[PDB]
Design a protein around this ligand. Sequence first.
Ligand SMILES: [Mg+2]
Ligand SMILES: [Mg+2]
Ligand SMILES: [Mg+2]
Ligand SMILES: [Mg+2]
Ligand SMILES: [Mg+2]
Ligand SMILES: [Mg+2]
Ligand SMILES: [Mg+2]
Ligand SMILES: [Mg+2]
Ligand SMILES: [Mg+2]
Ligand SMILES: [Mg+2]
Ligand SMILES: [Mg+2]
Ligand SMILES: [Mg+2]
Ligand SMILES: [Mg+2]
Ligand SMILES: [Mg+2]
Ligand SMILES: [Mg+2]
Ligand SMILES: [Mg+2]
Ligand SMILES: [Mg+2]
Ligand SMILES: [Mg+2]
Ligand SMILES: [Mg+2]
Ligand SMILES: [Mg+2]
Ligand SMILES: [Mg+2]
Ligand SMILES: [Mg+2]
Ligand SMILES: [Mg+2]
Ligand SMILES: [Mg+2]
Ligand SMILES: [Mg+2]
Ligand SMILES: [Mg+2]
Ligand SMILES: [Mg+2]
Ligand SMILES: [Mg+2]
Ligand SMILES: [Mg+2]
Ligand SMILES: [Mg+2]
Ligand SMILES: [Mg+2]
Ligand SMILES: [Mg+2]
Ligand SMILES: [Mg+2]
Ligand SMILES: [Mg+2]
Ligand SMILES: [Mg+2]
Ligand SMILES: [Mg+2]
Length: 86
Amino acid sequence: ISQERKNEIIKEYRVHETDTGSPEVQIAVLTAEINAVNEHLRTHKKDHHSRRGLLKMVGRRRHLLNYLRSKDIQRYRELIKSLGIR
RNA sequence: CUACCCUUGGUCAGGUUGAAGUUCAGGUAACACUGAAUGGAGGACCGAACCGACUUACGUUGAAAAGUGAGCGGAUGAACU
RNA sequence: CGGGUCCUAAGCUGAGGCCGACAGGCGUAGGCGAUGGAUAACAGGUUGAUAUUCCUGUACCACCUAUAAUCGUUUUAAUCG
RNA sequence: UAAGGAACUCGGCAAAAUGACCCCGUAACUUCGGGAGAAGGGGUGCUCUUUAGGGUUAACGCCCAGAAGAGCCGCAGUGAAUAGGCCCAAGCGACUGUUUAUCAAAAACACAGGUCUCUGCUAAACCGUAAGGUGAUGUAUAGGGGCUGACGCCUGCCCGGU
RNA sequence: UCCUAAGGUAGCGAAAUUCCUUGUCGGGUAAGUUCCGACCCGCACGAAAGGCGUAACGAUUUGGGCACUGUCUCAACGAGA
RNA sequence: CUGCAUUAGCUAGUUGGUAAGGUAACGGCUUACCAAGGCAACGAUGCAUAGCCGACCUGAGAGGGUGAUCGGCCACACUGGA
RNA sequence: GGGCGUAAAGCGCGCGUAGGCGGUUUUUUAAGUCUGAUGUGAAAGCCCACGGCUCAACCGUGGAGGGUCAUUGGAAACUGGAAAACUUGAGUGCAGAAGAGGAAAGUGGAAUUCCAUGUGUAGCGGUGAAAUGCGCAGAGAUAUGGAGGAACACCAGUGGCGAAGGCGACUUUCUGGUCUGUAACUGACGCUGAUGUGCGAAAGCGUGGGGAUCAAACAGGAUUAGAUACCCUGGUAGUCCACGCCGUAAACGAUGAGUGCUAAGUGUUAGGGGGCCCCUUAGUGCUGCAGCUAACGCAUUAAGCACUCCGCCUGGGGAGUA
RNA sequence: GUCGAAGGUGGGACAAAUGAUUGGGGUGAAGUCGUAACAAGGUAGCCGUAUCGGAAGGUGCGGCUGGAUC
RNA sequence: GGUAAAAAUGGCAA
Ligand SMILES: [Mg+2]
Ligand SMILES: [Mg+2]
Ligand SMILES: [Mg+2]
Ligand SMILES: [Mg+2]
Ligand SMILES: [Mg+2]
Ligand SMILES: [Mg+2]
Ligand SMILES: [Mg+2]
Ligand SMILES: [Mg+2]
Ligand SMILES: [Mg+2]
Ligand SMILES: [Mg+2]
Ligand SMILES: [Mg+2]
Ligand SMILES: [Mg+2]
Ligand SMILES: [Mg+2]
Ligand SMILES: [Mg+2]
Ligand SMILES: [Mg+2]
Ligand SMILES: [Mg+2]
Ligand SMILES: [Mg+2]
Ligand SMILES: [Mg+2]
Ligand SMILES: [Mg+2]
Ligand SMILES: [Mg+2]
Ligand SMILES: [Mg+2]
Ligand SMILES: [Mg+2]
Ligand SMILES: [Mg+2]
Ligand SMILES: [Mg+2]
Ligand SMILES: [Mg+2]
Ligand SMILES: [Mg+2]
Ligand SMILES: [Mg+2]
Ligand SMILES: [Mg+2]
Ligand SMILES: [Mg+2]
Ligand SMILES: [Mg+2]
Ligand SMILES: [Mg+2]
Ligand SMILES: [Mg+2]
Ligand SMILES: [Mg+2]
Ligand SMILES: [Mg+2]
Ligand SMILES: [Mg+2]
Ligand SMILES: [Mg+2]
């Protein structure tokens, strides 16, 4: 995804100004990137190498979503409805 | 008459099975996929009309120059008319 | 009411035309040709023998004649097409 | 129709047996569809009592349709009539279908599929002396002809002869 | 060693093909020229005049069970033409 | 406190509830009714094998093997039912 | 109280689920842990002591011991639980870097084969030597043109990239990962990974397309005792493309992954920093201590020293068979 | 009358024995055929795969060194 | 660059 679009996503989900590392920001950007590669894979179904990157991104999102639910369930519930992930 | 064909018409009680697809639920990164429900496929199933003619008995100067009786096959189809 | 004085399918025929010892074959325009399209009447009564056909009652369709509310009256704006 | 029960016979030919509906249950094998109604069993009348319902109605009523229990009668309750016999193997043909009108219905024909070959379009092929047609108002994923015949696994060697 | 264009492969096999032949052995039967399995000395199988399998299907051909019975032992009686 | 996954599904009185009956007694123990539960890779279900233990044999120990005599508990009494 | 480079043994390689394991500080709790008390763990036996049998065996008596036991009282370091912090791990941002990483279109040039003509002539081709073959119906050779498929010389390097298998003309589009610096941010969010789930050379299989080259099978020639080979001339599948299937290789570093620690010297790839030199990060080679090893060897790219987790081994054959 | 041992009937499951015949394995004469591997084993060998051949094996494709004189 | 081609076999003991 473009740095412009990424920056827009950070601003939408940043917990505080200057926040770039919160699970919310990281999950949101990951969600965008997963969708973009899923789009690539629809046209290019035999780009196995790119799909592997997508699999790693899905796992990293899962692990952060696991951590957030563990720490703050409200923050989790708000993030999943906002990003439409479940 | 009969064979095939052309054009235009008609007919096929009732019962059964339950394809694809779809929807919902679950499931997935997205798909596969799973379960219900829905759906109504087929030279599909059983069985009358109808069409046929496997067996057998009768009939054999016949009721009949090819039939009758009892069973028998198909019966939405390459159907029958 | 069914058919004709309506329509066309397959098919048949076919002015000229094309082809062919002859006879004749083929074929265009155009015709003909229902098994289909279009198309205005029903109930009751009645004979030994006919009936949506006769009769009784109540209808419908096309056309004609007359009188016509109204509308028009020649680039026409009433009307046919 | 005693007793027997295929001893009959070329051969169970014919006959007998099975048969309805409901419930339980159901194998090898398989192309996963099937096989299957597999098979093998159980129930079925009438009366009374209690009692889930559904359709149509304001309701009543009417129509449909169960369940449980307790009784009654006969040799027997789909009390008549009508309604699969079944199973295990082997050959052949995949299959539905077609055929010797009137001695053969089949393992024969056809078939979807395979393959070879011809054919560039006024196509090849076919009918006609021709004209004119079919092919096709189609155009090589098409059309004619030969052979093979679902599907699965396969399909070896020989071009000397014709 | 001789010959050929090349010498039949896989699979299958007393077979819708096997003369000899009721081959031989095993199974099934009290007893089986049929049948099934196996064997291979294939008279004279063999790969699209296809080879070998094959679920489903068959008024197909074939062998064996269960049930059933006047088919039979072996006939008898009754109804009707 | 036992082996086997070349045993992965198992169960319909089954899991729970309600009521009644029944038992010294609690309880699906049983029976109607209602619901769809219960169990299982932390090995259910199946199959095989086996009485269990105090002990006993061995081993430096940790372990391994075994379950005579004696004592405890359980089960059985020709087989099966009452 | 053993191992898995070469002896038997690292899954071909990822993505991940359960499970196992997990950085630093504080506070608290007390499940594990530690320390007592109480009850109980029959008797017999074992063990120890003593006593009785002439001794011993044996008999008797008293201790001692035997729980993964229960109940209850303390301790709190560690493990666990709870609460609150931290930034070193792990990520994110920001600023840079290189790359045959992947997918899909498009564009080139060399060469091979075939076909068409011109010139031209008696061979060409091939081998150890031959022959089959091709050619005289004009071959081969040479010149020019056309058709088609496949692969990309030079660059090119123990070079680069990728989890592995792999990836080499160029262009564009889409897309994955990695490294350096910085220290915005988050704040242990981590590691491994049974069962799962994907990817996976080549050959092979299915459907459709394509067919230059090479080439199982197959056919000639030759060699040979024979030659079902090696060599020669041909040649089909296949080799190529698409989409499915297969799921295996000495899929190898015969070396599982993660983390930290432990002499040096030298080359190279992509960076960073400071004065050609020095320092530094991540790769990639060679050489070589300590240590390790049966030896060979390995040696900061461990096969050294450690901790976590997974897979695997237990004589050979039968057999990777039934 | 309910329940009910034993018994009967039926379709399945599992186990063991046996069966014409057939398959590979093992062992055992100094049997027959060839010579595939070990040396550059006389075509380096081996791994996966495909196909072919009396037999070991051959050949194609990819891979490995656990090969490669000068 | 090469390269000459062909080039089989030989009981178990001690
Ligand atoms: Mg039918
Ligand atoms: Mg009849
Ligand atoms: Mg039928
Ligand atoms: Mg029928
Ligand atoms: Mg005419
Ligand atoms: Mg005229
Ligand atoms: Mg008419
Ligand atoms: Mg009259
Ligand atoms: Mg009798
Ligand atoms: Mg009798
Ligand atoms: Mg007889
Ligand atoms: Mg007789
Ligand atoms: Mg009969
Ligand atoms: Mg047939
Ligand atoms: Mg038929
Ligand atoms: Mg006839
Ligand atoms: Mg007949
Ligand atoms: Mg035929
Ligand atoms: Mg042939
Ligand atoms: Mg015989
Ligand atoms: Mg024949
Ligand atoms: Mg033939
Ligand atoms: Mg045939
Ligand atoms: Mg016992
Ligand atoms: Mg010891
Ligand atoms: Mg080894
Ligand atoms: Mg490895
Ligand atoms: Mg004691
Ligand atoms: Mg390939
Ligand atoms: Mg060659
Ligand atoms: Mg392997
Ligand atoms: Mg380094
Ligand atoms: Mg050799
Ligand atoms: Mg060799
Ligand atoms: Mg060969
Ligand atoms: Mg010797």
